[PDB]
Amino acid sequence: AAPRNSYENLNVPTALDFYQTSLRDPAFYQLYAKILDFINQYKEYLEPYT
Amino acid sequence: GENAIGPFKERRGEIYYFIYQQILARYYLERLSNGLGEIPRFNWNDRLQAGYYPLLTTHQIPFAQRNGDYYLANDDNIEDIQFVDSYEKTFLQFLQKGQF
Amino acid sequence: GYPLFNNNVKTKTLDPNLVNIQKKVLLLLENWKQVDPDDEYYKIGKEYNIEANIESYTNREVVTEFLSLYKTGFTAKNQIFSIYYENQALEVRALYRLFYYAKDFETFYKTAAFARVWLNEGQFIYAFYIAVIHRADTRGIVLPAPYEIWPEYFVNSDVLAKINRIQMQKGLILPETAQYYGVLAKDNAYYFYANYSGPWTYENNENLLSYFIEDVAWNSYYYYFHSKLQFWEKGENAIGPFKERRGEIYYFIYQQILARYYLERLSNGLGEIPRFNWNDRLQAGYYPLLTTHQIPFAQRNGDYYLANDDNIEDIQFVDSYEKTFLQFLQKGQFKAYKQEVDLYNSKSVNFVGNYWQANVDLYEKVPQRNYLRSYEDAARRILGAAPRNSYENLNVPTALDFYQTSLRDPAFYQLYAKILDFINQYKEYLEPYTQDVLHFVGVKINDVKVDKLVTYFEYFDWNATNAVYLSEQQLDTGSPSYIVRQPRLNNQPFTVTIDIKSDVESEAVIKIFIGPKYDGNGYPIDLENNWVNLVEIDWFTHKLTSGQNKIERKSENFFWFKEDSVSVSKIYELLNNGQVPRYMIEKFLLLPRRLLLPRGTEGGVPFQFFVFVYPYQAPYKEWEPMKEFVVDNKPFGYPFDRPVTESYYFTQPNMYFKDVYIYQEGEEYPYYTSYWSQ
Amino acid sequence: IEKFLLLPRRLLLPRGTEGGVPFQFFVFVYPYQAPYKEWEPMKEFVVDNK
Amino acid sequence: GYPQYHYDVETRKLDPSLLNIQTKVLSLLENWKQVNPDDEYYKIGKEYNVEANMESYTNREVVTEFLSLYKAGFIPKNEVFSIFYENQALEVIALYRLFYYAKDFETFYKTAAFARVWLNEGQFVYAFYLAVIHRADTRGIVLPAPYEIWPEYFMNSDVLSKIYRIQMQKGLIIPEQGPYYGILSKDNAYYFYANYSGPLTYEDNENLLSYFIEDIGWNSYYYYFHNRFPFWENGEQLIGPLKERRGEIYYYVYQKILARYYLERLANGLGEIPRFNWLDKYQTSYYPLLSSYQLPFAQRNDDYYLASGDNINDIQFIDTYEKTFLQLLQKGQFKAYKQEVDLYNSKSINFVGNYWQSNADLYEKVPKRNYWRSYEATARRVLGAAPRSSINYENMNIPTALDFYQTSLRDPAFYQLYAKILDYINEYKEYLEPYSQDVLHYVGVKINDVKVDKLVTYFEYFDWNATNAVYLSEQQLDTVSPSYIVRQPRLNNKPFTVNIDIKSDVESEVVVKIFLGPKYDGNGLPISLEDNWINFIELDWFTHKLTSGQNKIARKSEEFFFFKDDSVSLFKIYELLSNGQVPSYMVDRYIYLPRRLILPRGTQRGFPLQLFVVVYPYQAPVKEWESMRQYIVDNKPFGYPFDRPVTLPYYFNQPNMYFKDVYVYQEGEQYPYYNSYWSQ
Amino acid sequence: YYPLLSSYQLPFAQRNDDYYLASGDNINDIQFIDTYEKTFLQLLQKGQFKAYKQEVDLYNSKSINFVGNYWQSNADLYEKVPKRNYWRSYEATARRVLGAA
């Protein structure tokens, strides 16, 4: 949700811009939950263990 | 992969999936312990429902703040939005093809 | 006040050999909601062991799969069953395969008794009905009509409440007043007058056509279509030689259904079928007054947003499934699902149809997949508006979850209109028919006349005893007859006379279609846009001699319509004389004749008839086992199976268009059923 | 130096309550099979070939 | 597995002069859904004519209006009745007025028989229950609990389906398989195990507290509150001596109902009650599994839009109403409905209450109006989400949980609506001057310590009779009805005692009040009194005599003023009547919350709460309030001292006040759904 | 508005584009705001009236005084009424709503 600009010399930092602060944002968890939901949809292909 | 992991180069995606799944599982356990329920899902064409007002600064520059009801698809994001959507749909198409 | 429907049934002698089987089948359909320990099947079911009889089934893999599934545990009794629930569908498919691969009738009967004794009643009845429809040894046997097997799916909550009250009271406490509440006691039976749903259930004036969309036979036709050609069965085991024409059948049936619905809407002045956007909200409210096991059906408000937090995934899939198809239209010739597809060729229709049904035939060339998805299933789930839950033991039923109640929901019509719009976008590829194919040299239709077209409402009685639970005494000796008497649309007999001239003596095929003349806006519809709204009503052959010819075709002989089914009591009465209702054996998958014409008005509603005469060509050889549903080698819906681009080059001397008016006699509305109105 | 990429032990269990929060443990025993040869340089993060 | 409820009933001897009325009443409530021609009431009602006995009613206009409406025609039998349906409301009000003004019990019985024989069953039962509660010559008799009069409004569809199947089959075809489906055949009766609603009905994890919001006692308490203080009746008939406090009562009850509810939300970690905007999509969905006459209850889909064109008019009225109140807050002193109002005075509360109930007392000084509209009724209609055709057409209605006082508390939207109303009322309350030290400080009295025993909650089986839900055969009516008993888990708390130590310099009479409240909010932070004054629930209120020196007061939870015992079943009522005794609580304490619902459960198995104890001087109520002594302990306003906002909390750090922190624990199963055959 | 301002290292509130002001949490405030505006319009229809125990005639230019005070919710607006423990300001409520904190 940072302001969008085409200038490379001006940025407003966000928690998701750094791996040191990514886990502080719930949006991180929601996004990667979506990604893992897609990956589990893929995993549905695999044959279950016998 | 060669310069970062070496012989475990063909298992990179497995590591990615395992680490992220473990992180999300621990987060879900903490939520259950605090009685917050499951992780919400969201729609890109709809608005995110997670407000965040970090009290963080670097070089005195404040971190970005997001309100409770933030519309993700605005005038200046359309392009990015489109890409995201496409990147998802292609994957679904792969699931229909199986072998490709 | 309306006249009471009485008509003798055209019956045919039954082969004595099958007689016993008939009996047994009926014995397995009596009070299927309850298990009676005193019945014969109970001991057989409690003692039968499938594994010990593994040699009695032709295929061994089916038995192994069924046993493996049964080891895990099937669904409990007294629970709602739906083919759209994944686990229940998986179990019922195995049960049906076990029924289908039984060596002989004795093994099948033993397996059915076992299933009824041990398994869920809904799964058992579904599988048994389908198997009896499909099993070769049971071919030629009469089955009860669907509305008599699942009465609760074909009547509203008030009538069922009255019936349940009568059953609980074991009669009337103050009989002389029951008449004032639409309950008549007569001839060892109880008759319950019933109304159709009103504006409370349907919004935007849709309730005006409730007499049509809620008709018992209208929904029974869709259930029969599902049973004969089920999406989860391979083409070989369901249709045989007409396996490459499955998509054509799908498209034809759905197009005819939507065309008839549009004709009814025009007759009621409701306009065209609305279109909707998935990312936007549906604008069709529905509040069904239906219940199964007292569990209410899902309700949808007027302005329902389809894309919520718990549906996103499904939504995405739907969108993708559409876009891929559009991409195919851009490619034209491609390779999908290990199958080469060329859209320039008409036969590709098959693929298209399967693609939009996600049936097993679509995946016959790829390895067995554990990842399963269906566009129609996801669309039905989204449109049903039922609460979303991840628990498999809790469901809120919706009208779209059952083929017996799907046609009651406008969302069904809207969704399949969207699907057929995509299919017509595909059809735009095909080359239009040319004059040489259409013109019938030496044949000209001089005239066409039709008698007065009349529609009315008449009382119809159907048995609804299976909806209640009987007592031990009733099971042992006899149960009462709870009969629902409701108004239904019907039309008086009419004849079509065709005057033709042909100096050449030859064999020919005549087709008759009925269609609209004006759209919702009151303007005439050009053939280039009306080709998709024409309903085929007749299809026959005739030998033309040199000179003049006059053909008289009666409405009782039309190919695409049947007569009404009869109750079980008459079936037993005829069976006692070695006879069966011929139309319940012959042409039991077609629409009833009473729904041929849309309800008219006092002044008259305008429509048109299209008559087409073309050369005859015999159906192919390998098509011999199915030479009771076809008349020639032309595609279904010919010549309107592909778009008409120029009406000038389509019209020929051997084609005729006539304008007709449909009138209404008696009451215009069907709700005049009160004690004071009789 | 050793195991500096893993989670701390202090975060192993979710915070409990005075009355107690319910969870479950799953214990699985299976046959052992040694990791592959070319996997030798990384035989400090794995225990078998699964 | 859960234990079975066993408890002793407090009984009092019944006046011998009332032995005839009681029976008669209990005879007219038997199988009220059906009319038996073999009964005496049938003949009496068939032959009785109202006009010929016009002299037997005190008021003559009542008879004339009833005759006019009856000539116009009442609703037919076998249809859903609701007091919110305007025509049905008029008819039932006329019938009740005819019942109430009957000069003697004999005429009342004849009129009741006539109504049962000729009129709709629902209207008859509603009016008869109200009249028995309000008639002077019926004071002292006992009525069956609401859940036994309307079983279908207190159970889900599955249990009702099982009961109907058993009734239709007249038993079990295969008895051995009954237990596997929750049906037990024992002692000539059939017991059906009942669950509570699950996530299908409630979203956002609210089903966790279903056991509380679907409890029979909760809805029965709401229905009793409605019956004792109907909105359409004049205050004088309802409350004679303390009519001017009607609005205050309206504020006291709802404020309690929400507060307890809020407490439960804190016990299950659900947070605060949501607020909503009328002109925006409603985010709370509801899918009730309830049905009346097999007609399903209306279902509200998530994100339902309330401001559609069809409802627009109603919306406007709602908005206007709210706006008007705010304007009044700016005026302070004004005249409304020909009543002078000054908001600087606490008495004005009365008016405020009436204003938000749209009751008769609000329009007592204006000429009789043919135009009338209720804010609560309009809001209930809007939030019900029933199709507009149901509203427009009179001979058809789809029932909603908000159309009945027996099922209103099941719908989450009720709590949000009344929270909005109470927010407006508290905005009004901000006018009042806060209590000073002089009124709060009891010179010479100091509380030394407050001790409390262990607070424990648990689920236990409770059986209630649901025979009235089914239709009986002629033989059953003649000889005896079947017994269908619903067995369901219910919350309960073990007995506990509060011990208070007080040091007094002088001897005097004092009044002691005990309140309960929460400690932490949804976000886990402590709640200051300035915001917690509205969340405290009044538990006990009693007088005492303090002698000079040290004194100890032991108060048992079984003696709290604001709670009652559980109502007894019909068979036990007959058993006690045959011995000339009646349950006292059902006689005169039925308007109080059940004692089993005092404490929350808690999903973490341990929940922190706080108790507040206050002692103040005793002053006898004014004499004119003589016939209300059983319900008033002193002259202080209800909820005192937490009846007005607290601005400076350090005024409540008085010697005669004490705050204590306590913990509530759970014993046994944490959840109530472990009631299967294999778990029992 | 994304101010780069801070007091005691606490960042100033940032208002995202397309911020919705009529959420449930603010609904009460919104209503008050609306009501206030509505009231003024009603006064314009009355022309001459009495508000806060002050006689006002809008045909006179002097009335400007009252109008100003009415839109500032200052002390002079409530000088003729008894001291009120209940007080709310249109400007303060609007500032709170638009601040997006």
Ligand SMILES: *[C@@H]1O[C@H](CO)[C@@H](O[C@@H]2O[C@H](CO)[C@@H](O[C@@H]3O[C@H](CO[C@H]4O[C@H](CO)[C@@H](O)[C@H](O[C@H]5O[C@H](CO)[C@@H](O)[C@H](O)[C@@H]5O)[C@@H]4O)[C@@H](O)[C@H](O[C@H]4O[C@H](CO)[C@@H](O)[C@H](O)[C@@H]4O[C@H]4O[C@H](CO)[C@@H](O)[C@H](O)[C@@H]4O)[C@@H]3O)[C@H](O)[C@H]2NC(C)=O)[C@H](O)[C@H]1NC(C)=O
């Ligand atoms: C209020 O709500 C609660 C909450 O839902 C309800 O409580 C539920 O009630 C149902 C039905 O009463 C319970 O289901 C039953 O559970 C039985 C106990 O099984 C346990 O042991 C077996 C091994 O013996 C385990 O397999 C079970 O679970 C494990 O296995 C399942 C297999 O699917 C897995 O899914 C699990 O994850 C576990 O790994 C339990 O640990 C069980 O015996 C019983 O099963 C019979 O019936 C089912 C019906 O589908 C068959 O599939 C199965 O093969 C068994 O066959 C019987 O079927 C019928 C009888 O129904 C007859 O032909 C025979 O008797 C035959 O033996 C069934 O599944 C559920 O466990 C329970 N949930 C709880 C307590 O949390 C209350 O009922 C409800 N109350 C009311 C009044 O509505």
Ligand SMILES: *[C@@H]1O[C@H](CO)[C@@H](O[C@@H]2O[C@H](CO)[C@@H](O[C@@H]3O[C@H](CO[C@H]4O[C@H](CO)[C@@H](O)[C@H](O)[C@@H]4O)[C@@H](O)[C@H](O[C@H]4O[C@H](CO)[C@@H](O)[C@H](O)[C@@H]4O[C@H]4O[C@H](CO)[C@@H](O)[C@H](O)[C@@H]4O)[C@@H]3O)[C@H](O)[C@H]2NC(C)=O)[C@H](O)[C@H]1NC(C)=O
């Ligand atoms: C399918 O849907 C249709 C349409 O909704 C529905 O038709 C309606 O049926 C109801 C009955 O259920 C009809 O209501 C009755 O109408 C008759 C006739 O009324 C006409 O004629 C009288 C003069 O004779 C006019 O005054 C009147 O305005 C009409 O023009 C009435 O006679 C009935 O009145 C009795 O019942 C009322 C309660 O319903 C009482 O209020 C009234 O006083 C009457 O009481 C009678 O019974 C009492 C109880 O036993 C007894 O005590 C009294 O002494 C008296 O005998 C009633 O109003 C309605 O008109 C129909 N509408 C239409 C358009 O046809 C079907 O019933 C429905 N079918 C099913 C199966 O559901």
Ligand SMILES: *[C@@H]1O[C@H](CO)[C@@H](O[C@@H]2O[C@H](CO)[C@@H](O[C@@H]3O[C@H](CO[C@H]4O[C@H](CO)[C@@H](O)[C@H](O[C@H]5O[C@H](CO)[C@@H](O)[C@H](O)[C@@H]5O)[C@@H]4O)[C@@H](O)[C@H](O[C@H]4O[C@H](CO)[C@@H](O)[C@H](O)[C@@H]4O)[C@@H]3O)[C@H](O)[C@H]2NC(C)=O)[C@H](O)[C@H]1NC(C)=O
């Ligand atoms: C669940 O709920 C159901 C329904 O509420 C309960 O069933 C009820 O049980 C009670 C207690 O058993 C019943 O009341 C008793 O009924 C008996 C039987 O009465 C019948 O038989 C009599 C001859 O044996 C006959 O005279 C009666 O008819 C008289 O009365 C009617 C009016 O009721 C009148 O119209 C007639 O003209 C007659 O005058 C009737 O046909 C009865 O003997 C009992 O009376 C005793 O007690 C009363 C009160 O103390 C006293 O006055 C009497 O003198 C006598 O001592 C008593 O009335 C009730 O009828 C049942 N209801 C139904 C619908 O059947 C069930 O018990 C509950 N189960 C639980 C809680 O587990």
Ligand SMILES: *[C@@H]1O[C@H](CO)[C@@H](O[C@@H]2O[C@H](CO)[C@@H](O[C@@H]3O[C@H](CO)[C@@H](O)[C@H](O)[C@@H]3O)[C@H](O)[C@H]2NC(C)=O)[C@H](O)[C@H]1NC(C)=O
């Ligand atoms: C409505 O449906 C019910 C149930 O299907 C019908 O009851 C059924 O009637 C048939 C024919 O009478 C019964 O079969 C016969 O049973 C006798 C023994 O009673 C036997 O001798 C005959 O050979 C024949 O099998 C059947 O048992 C019975 N079912 C039940 C559950 O009682 C009813 O007749 C139907 N009514 C109408 C009007 O169609």
Ligand SMILES: [Cu+2]
């Ligand atoms: Cu929601």
